[PDB]
């Protein structure tokens, strides 16, 4: 269901999450964006637990 | 710089990269989406 997905994306604010990811990518313009995204999400996880 | 940004996104196929992570995200609907995405880019970044 597109509907299960749409509700999950809304509750977790995934649009804001992608938006923030894009801003960081555009600020950093990393050589390895997959490595940079991995490190960014790890950083966010740590902050969230803090 | 905006033009620097669009060019980066184009060159690194960022739209495709992120769309595929969301496809995987809606398949799993994980309890912890940031942990899931971290592991997904880790996997991608090993394949």
């Amino acid at each position: 269901s597109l509907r299960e997905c749409e509700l999950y994306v809304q509750k977790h604010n995934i649009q804001a999450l992608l938006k923030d990811s894009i801003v960081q990518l555009c600020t950093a313009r990393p050589e390895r964006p997959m490595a940079f995204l991995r490190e960014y999400f790890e950083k966010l996880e740590k902050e969230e637990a803090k | 710089s905006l033009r620097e940004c669009e060019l980066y996104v184009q060159k690194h196929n960022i739209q495709a990269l992120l769309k595929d992570s969301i496809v995987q995200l809606c398949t799993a609907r994980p309890e912890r989406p940031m942990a899931f995405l971290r592991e997904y880019f880790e996997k991608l970044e090993k394949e």
Partner: peptide, 23 residues
């Protein structure tokens, strides 16, 4: 603000894309 608006629109586009690819 230009970079923020671009990220906001791209985010919306990628999400539409993805949602009409898982269905």
């Amino acid at each position: 603000t230009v970079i923020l608006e671009y990220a906001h629109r791209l985010s919306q586009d990628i999400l539409c894309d993805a949602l009409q690819q898982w269905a």
